[PDB]
Structure formats: structure tokens, C-alpha cells
Nucleic acid binder design. Structure first.
Ligand SMILES: [Zn+2]
Ligand SMILES: [Zn+2]
Length: 50
RNA sequence: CUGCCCUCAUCCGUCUCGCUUAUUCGGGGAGCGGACGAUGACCCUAGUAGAGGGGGCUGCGGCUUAGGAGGGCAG
């Protein structure tokens, strides 16, 4: 499926999911952190203590 | 304008800090705004402009870019 050029995340041409301006929520989120680029926890639970 | 970091994460501790609130108002109680701190990670390379590697996300096609808003610093 050569859909290159048409975004599927939002549905707007010119860019793709990788460059989707709506890239934030409503996706999947396995166990990564899109706030500190962390690998394991979630952004919603991303924070520091000591 | 771009990079990084922090805050909204119904987060925490600190702050002679600011605001609001209590039968629409003050150095206390609480919530929020600002600073500090979970790239677990950045470093290196050759022909140092810039470019690439794992690496950013992806419908794998890729491009190598940018990603909601406010503050600090750098050019
Ligand atoms: Zn899009
Ligand atoms: Zn995180």
C-alpha cells in the first residue's frame, strides 16, 4: 500500500504519522514515555522524587 | 526563530515567591503558575558547511524531521 504522502493518523496529505502534528494521544502507547523519552514507564506517570 | 530542560503528570519536597478560595478576599489550610530533578543513553566518526551510525516516530513506504502551551538558558 503505497500511501506515501497521505497521513493516516489524522488524515492529511503532505506528511505522515512520523510527522503528524496531532501525534500525542489516541494511538496505542505500549510502555514508553513521550515526555522524557523514557523506556518503560508512561508519560502520565512520568515524574521525579529524589 | 531552533535546541535542551522543567511545569499542566487531579505531581512531589523547598521557596521573607504570585494568584484564588472559605455563606463572591491577606505571612495558616488547600489548588494551581514559576524554578530544581525517571534522553535507563548519548557519544563518536571521517573529508569539522553539513553528513551519517544505533538513534526520533512510522500504515515499513520512509524521511532524518518535526511534533499543544508557558518560563529559563544558548546562537
Ligand atoms: Zn498527520
Ligand atoms: Zn518519562
Amino acid at each position: 500500500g503505497r500511501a506515501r504522502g497521505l497521513c493516516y493518523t489524522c488524515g492529511s496529505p503532505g506528511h505522515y504519522q512520523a510527522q503528524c502534528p496531532k501525534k500525542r494521544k489516541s494511538g496505542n502507547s505500549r510502555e514508553r514515555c513521550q515526555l522524557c523519552n523514557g523506556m518503560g514507564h508512561n508519560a502520565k506517570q512520568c515524574r521525579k522524587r529524589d
